[PDB]
Amino acid sequence: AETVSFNFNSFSEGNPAINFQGDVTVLSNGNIQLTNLNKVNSVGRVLYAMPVRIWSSATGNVASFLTSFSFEMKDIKDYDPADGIIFFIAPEDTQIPAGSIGGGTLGVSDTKGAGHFVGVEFDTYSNSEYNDPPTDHVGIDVNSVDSVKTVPWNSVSGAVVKVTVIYDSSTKTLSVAVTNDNGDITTIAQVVDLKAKLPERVKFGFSASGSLGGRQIHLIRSWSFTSTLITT
Amino acid sequence: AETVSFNFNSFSEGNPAINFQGDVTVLSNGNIQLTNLNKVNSVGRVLYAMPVRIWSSATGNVASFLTSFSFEMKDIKDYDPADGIIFFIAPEDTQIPAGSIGGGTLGVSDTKGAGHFVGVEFDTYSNSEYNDPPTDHVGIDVNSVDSVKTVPWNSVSGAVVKVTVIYDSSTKTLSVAVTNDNGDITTIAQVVDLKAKLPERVKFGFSASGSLGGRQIHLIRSWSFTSTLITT
Amino acid sequence: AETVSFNFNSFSEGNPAINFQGDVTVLSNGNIQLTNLNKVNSVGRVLYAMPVRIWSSATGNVASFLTSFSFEMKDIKDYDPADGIIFFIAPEDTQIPAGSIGGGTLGVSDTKGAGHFVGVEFDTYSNSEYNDPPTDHVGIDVNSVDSVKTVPWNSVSGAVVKVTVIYDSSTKTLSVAVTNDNGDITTIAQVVDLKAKLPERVKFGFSASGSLGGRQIHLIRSWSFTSTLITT
Amino acid sequence: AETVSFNFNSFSEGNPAINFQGDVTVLSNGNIQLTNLNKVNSVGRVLYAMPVRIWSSATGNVASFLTSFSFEMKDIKDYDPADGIIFFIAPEDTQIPAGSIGGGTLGVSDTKGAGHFVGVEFDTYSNSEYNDPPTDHVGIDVNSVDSVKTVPWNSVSGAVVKVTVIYDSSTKTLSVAVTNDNGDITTIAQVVDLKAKLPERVKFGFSASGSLGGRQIHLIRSWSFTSTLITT
Ligand SMILES: OC[C@H]1O[C@@H](O[C@H]2[C@H](O)[C@@H](O)[C@@H](O)O[C@@H]2CO)[C@H](O)[C@@H](O)[C@H]1O
Numbered sequence: 025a026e027t028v029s030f031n032f033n034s035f036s037e038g039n040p041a042i043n044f045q046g047d048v049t050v051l052s053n054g055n056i057q058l059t060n061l062n063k064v065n066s067v068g069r070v071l072y073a074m075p076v077r078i079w080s081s082a083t084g085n086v087a088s089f090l091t092s093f094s095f096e097m098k099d100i101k102d103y104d105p106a107d108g109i110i111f112f113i114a115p116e117d118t119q120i121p122a123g124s125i126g127g128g129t130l131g132v133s134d135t136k137g138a139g140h141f142v143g144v145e146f147d148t149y150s151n152s153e154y155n156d157p158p159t160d161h162v163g164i165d166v167n168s169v170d171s172v173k174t175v176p177w178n179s180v181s182g183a184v185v186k187v188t189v190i191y192d193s194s195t196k197t198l199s200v201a202v203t204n205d206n207g208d209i210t211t212i213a214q215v216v217d218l219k220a221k222l223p224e225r226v227k228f229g230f231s232a233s234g235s236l237g238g239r240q241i242h243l244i245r246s247w248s249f250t251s252t253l254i255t256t
Numbered sequence: 257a258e259t260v261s262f263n264f265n266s267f268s269e270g271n272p273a274i275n276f277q278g279d280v281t282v283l284s285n286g287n288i289q290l291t292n293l294n295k296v297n298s299v300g301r302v303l304y305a306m307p308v309r310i311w312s313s314a315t316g317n318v319a320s321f322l323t324s325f326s327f328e329m330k331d332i333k334d335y336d337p338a339d340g341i342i343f344f345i346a347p348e349d350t351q352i353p354a355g356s357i358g359g360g361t362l363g364v365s366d367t368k369g370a371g372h373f374v375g376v377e378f379d380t381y382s383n384s385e386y387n388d389p390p391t392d393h394v395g396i397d398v399n400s401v402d403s404v405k406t407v408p409w410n411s412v413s414g415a416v417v418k419v420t421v422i423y424d425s426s427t428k429t430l431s432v433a434v435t436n437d438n439g440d441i442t443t444i445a446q447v448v449d450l451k452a453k454l455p456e457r458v459k460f461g462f463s464a465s466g467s468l469g470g471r472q473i474h475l476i477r478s479w480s481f482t483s484t485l486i487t488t
Numbered sequence: 489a490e491t492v493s494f495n496f497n498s499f500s501e502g503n504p505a506i507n508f509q510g511d512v513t514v515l516s517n518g519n520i521q522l523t524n525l526n527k528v529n530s531v532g533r534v535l536y537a538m539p540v541r542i543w544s545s546a547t548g549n550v551a552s553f554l555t556s557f558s559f560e561m562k563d564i565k566d567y568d569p570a571d572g573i574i575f576f577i578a579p580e581d582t583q584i585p586a587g588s589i590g591g592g593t594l595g596v597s598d599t600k601g602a603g604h605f606v607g608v609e610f611d612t613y614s615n616s617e618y619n620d621p622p623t624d625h626v627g628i629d630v631n632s633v634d635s636v637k638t639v640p641w642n643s644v645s646g647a648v649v650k651v652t653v654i655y656d657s658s659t660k661t662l663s664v665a666v667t668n669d670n671g672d673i674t675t676i677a678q679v680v681d682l683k684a685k686l687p688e689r690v691k692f693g694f695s696a697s698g699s700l701g702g703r704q705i706h707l708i709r710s711w712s713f714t715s716t717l718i719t720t
Numbered sequence: 721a722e723t724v725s726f727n728f729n730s731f732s733e734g735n736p737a738i739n740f741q742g743d744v745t746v747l748s749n750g751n752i753q754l755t756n757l758n759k760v761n762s763v764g765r766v767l768y769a770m771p772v773r774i775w776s777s778a779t780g781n782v783a784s785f786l787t788s789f790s791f792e793m794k795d796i797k798d799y800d801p802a803d804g805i806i807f808f809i810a811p812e813d814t815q816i817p818a819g820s821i822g823g824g825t826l827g828v829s830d831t832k833g834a835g836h837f838v839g840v841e842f843d844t845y846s847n848s849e850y851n852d853p854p855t856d857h858v859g860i861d862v863n864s865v866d867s868v869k870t871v872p873w874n875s876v877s878g879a880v881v882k883v884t885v886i887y888d889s890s891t892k893t894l895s896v897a898v899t900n901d902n903g904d905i906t907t908i909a910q911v912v913d914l915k916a917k918l919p920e921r922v923k924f925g926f927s928a929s930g931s932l933g934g935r936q937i938h939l940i941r942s943w944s945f946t947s948t949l950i951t952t
């Protein structure tokens with residue numbers, strides 16, 4: 025089996041295992057801050073530097089993966105707490121969309137909310153233009169921030185959020201378990217054929233964004249990931 | 257929302273939160289040994305004492321849950337490494353099948369392999385009578401040890417295995433992620449309607465068994481659990 | 489060349505190849521539990537029964553050796569996690585010091601912290617009397633628990649720890665590699681002249697201890713060992 | 721801490737985590753054959769694709785690493801064998817020397833035996849031009865195949881060799897433990913300041929070479945690696 029695994033309990037600038045895109049910044053406490061509180065339409069993305077092969081065109085096999093991470097979003101005075109964070113998977117050539125307006129695109133889609141990626145979003149602002157639910161929510165996105173499915177959620181400022189995601193290649197099921205600060209859990213599942221939506225080689229990462237009036241602190245605190253591809 | 261969460265980093269007899277059935281024993285190191293290496297057709301089970309309401313006959317809602325646990329199976333001289341462990345969900349009044357033959361039944365089914373339970377088994381012996389795959393495997397069982405679906409797996413003697421389970425109520429999807437000692441992960445998912453197969457109040461636990469010729473060390477090292485039922 | 493090698497994937501009471509000293513006990517899972525959670529100032533040591541020839545008085549040569557073992561230390565209610573484990577090399581007639589107070593002596597030294605042995609300690613309590621660093625640590629001990637050199641370490645309760653030790657005869661260098669649960673490694677190396685500190689024949693083993701208020705589970709799960717002495 | 725760990729129990733083509741240089745080939749059993757038995761002066765090198773940061777110019781710290789791997793060298797009819805394998809560390813832009821003559825250079829140095837790298841060699845031919853000992857041997861190389869230190873060794877055709885390496889950063893000690901097929905171990909250690917001889921980012925890998933008359937099968941069977949850099 026072809027396994028890729030890494031664990032980050034903190035991040036440091038210069039680690040070749042991580043690729044920073046946009047307004048990302050590593051705080052002295054080891055945490056990654058995704059957006060710049062002083063920039064308009066700030067977008068910051070952090071990707072695992074090594075491309076992962078999620079499926080083989082030879083065997084036709086798709087990898088299963090288990091990843092968990094924890095983030096934190098804190099409000100700042102006296103800006104709107106937006107827009108949030110998205111854990112995504114994209115082709116290895118993925119770059120912040122040219123002319124990105126940040127905001128509701130979450131740094132992974134164009135103005136229409138379209139892009140090439142699969143991800144789980146933790147949305148804190150309701151963008152009618154992308155058909156967002158009326159409240160905070162977790163959503164499964166497939167090439168669009170107009171989520172294929174969303175579930176009500178509640179982003180608590182300054183609260184640490186723990187997420188666990190399991191992708192089972194046989195059923196092509198992506199299940200997410202989000203553990204809120206209060207102890208309750210929120211789940212959302214969705215069948216997504218990675219082999220049909222993405223190329224053999226992809227990159228995993230987080231992305232966050234803001235707008236002119238929408239800004240907040242987006243922190244990634246830790247990240248563990250493991251993918252295993254059956255090579256026969 | 258009605259939430260139930262508990263976490264054991266170690267166990268101990270005398271703790272009212274855990275029910276013990278059969279040949280179960282708690283080692284001084286805090287681990288739970290399910291089978292007695294000196295008994296024929298040994299069967300041991302452990303359950304969270306407090307029953308958990310997984311679905312409501314009033315609202316029709318079904319709970320979502322996140323649970324992870326770690327176990328260890330080791331070979332004992334010159335007996336066969338069987339049968340294994342099964343994490344199950346059962347009616348709150350569940351007992352070890354009357355006149356149980358242990359072995360392939362895993363302590364949850366009758367001789368024909370039938371029973372009232374839903375579980376994830378970590379099967380180390382191939383019982384043709386229950387249509388087992390030809391190798392060690394992980395399987396989803398719905399009222400039968402004749403798994404609804406299985407996936408090839410490999411039980412490594414003396415190694416500590418970490419399991420993460422997610423049940424998404426909305427899609428009724430139960431997905432399992434098994435992290436092997438070598439870092440490799442194995443996943444398996446199956447849609448299972450808990451509301452249809454189980455009562456509103458159920459019990460979670462672990463069960464392991466052995467036969468006359470088949471025996472091995474079955475250890476439960478840790479267990480965290482959190483279920484959240486929407487009450488509206 | 490004279491080579492001594494053995495491998496233990498589990499132990500058992502009654503195996504003549506192992507010397508049990510003190511409060512040591514073998515669990516039904518094959519783990520060796522060094523101290524007794526109920527005894528005051530408990531001390532337990534395990535030694536490979538066959539004395540090993542680490543140097544020849546004829547050739548002047550010292551043996552090189554490669555050994556790796558795994559252990560687990562867990563906290564018990566409530567109740568300090570001390571004192572820890574030590575992998576030591578001592579005269580073949582070594583016994584627990586008379587009147588041993590356990591505690592920071594790790595069961596290998598007298599009250600002043602002196603003894604006849606060489607070892608690697610995994611110290612989880614800071615004994616000022618022995619000039620311990622303020623935190624958990626791994627130290628190289630030469631005839632005293634007042635370490636020749638220590639390195640900061642962190643003992644995680646219930647975590648399985650893997651250790652690899654290489655002793656190079658030509659350079660008389662002892663290097664240790666500790667793989668924590670999170671995947672991180674901790675190393676510490678130190679030049680130690682075995683021939684000048686220990687007799688021709690020695691025994692290898694582990695020791696651990698507790699005090700009145702300091703107690704924890706000290707377990708040895710596995711241990712492989714190979715030593716080679718050039719006789720020419 | 722900043723850790724990088726990977727584990728290969730077998731290799732496969734197409735894995736983005738592995739870089740192939742020269743005459744490397746992946747056998748169906750997952751083993752890597754470094755040289756081409758039908759080419760003159762064959763050179764094959766496999767590298768971990770991701771560059772690793774072994775020292776920070778900011779903190780001045782050096783990473784400690786633990787790596788073990790297994791290889792096999794088997795004679796082929798009536799050719800000399802010749803030359804061998806080397807485990808090396810080099811600048812992230814490392815390529816097979818231009819106009820490499822293979823043979824004694826082991827695929828990492830020029831004709832004079834010079835190059836930019838640090839490695840552990842398993843040399844099976846005695847090149848007087850590089851001052852090789854008269855017998856097979858293991859040697860520590862620092863920018864030259866003219867080893868800083870060597871130790872007598874014997875390469876048994878068809879034998880699976882297990883190697884374990886520990887690099888302690890504080891002491892800058894590189895310790896190697898070689899386990900031969902007959903159970904005997906060979907060790908060799910040397911102080912090497914990686915910070916002084918190499919840049920912050922390097923790549924780890926294996927290299928094997930042959931000549932017109934010297935050829936043999938060079939196989940890398942497995943390889944696990946873990947390095948930790950203190951970021952503070
Ligand atoms: O708490 C762990 C440390 O205990 C020290 O001994 C204590 C003893 O446990 C307590 O009951 C009382 O008598 O005070 C003693 C001295 O502080 C050990 O000396 C030390 O090694 C730890 O085990």
Ligand SMILES: OC[C@H]1O[C@@H](O[C@H]2[C@H](O)[C@@H](O)[C@@H](O)O[C@@H]2CO)[C@H](O)[C@@H](O)[C@H]1O
Binds near residue numbers: 800801933
């Ligand atoms: O016999 C193995 C050694 O060969 C040396 O090269 C030889 C070459 O094989 C032979 O055909 C002729 O050209 O003489 C050369 C010089 O001895 C390599 O240099 C040495 O590394 C071994 O591979």
Ligand SMILES: OC[C@H]1O[C@@H](O[C@H]2[C@H](O)[C@@H](O)[C@H](O)O[C@@H]2CO)[C@H](O)[C@@H](O)[C@H]1O
Binds near residue numbers: 129151236
């Ligand atoms: O208020 C957060 C919200 O802002 C939207 O963008 C606003 C922008 O902040 C404001 O300065 C401008 O006048 O109008 C824009 C459109 O409403 C973002 O589009 C949205 O994603 C949130 O970030």
Ligand SMILES: OC[C@H]1O[C@@H](O[C@H]2[C@H](O)[C@@H](O)[C@H](O)O[C@@H]2CO)[C@H](O)[C@@H](O)[C@H]1O
Binds near residue numbers: 361383468469470
């Ligand atoms: O090999 C373990 C295997 O045993 C089967 O039962 C055996 C039994 O162990 C033996 O004593 C008897 O003579 O034959 C039985 C039939 O094979 C169990 O059925 C199976 O589950 C394993 O436990």
Ligand SMILES: [Ca+2]
Binds near residue numbers: 107128147149150156
């Ligand atoms: Ca939005």
Ligand SMILES: [Ca+2]
Binds near residue numbers: 380381
């Ligand atoms: Ca079975």
Ligand SMILES: [Ca+2]
Binds near residue numbers: 591
């Ligand atoms: Ca101490």
Ligand SMILES: [Ca+2]
Binds near residue numbers: 803823824843846852
């Ligand atoms: Ca040579």
Ligand SMILES: [Mn+2]
Binds near residue numbers: 147156163
């Ligand atoms: Mn949204």
Ligand SMILES: [Mn+2]
Binds near residue numbers: 379401
């Ligand atoms: Mn089965």
Ligand SMILES: [Mn+2]
Binds near residue numbers: 611620633635
């Ligand atoms: Mn100490």
Ligand SMILES: [Mn+2]
Binds near residue numbers: 841853857865867
């Ligand atoms: Mn050489």
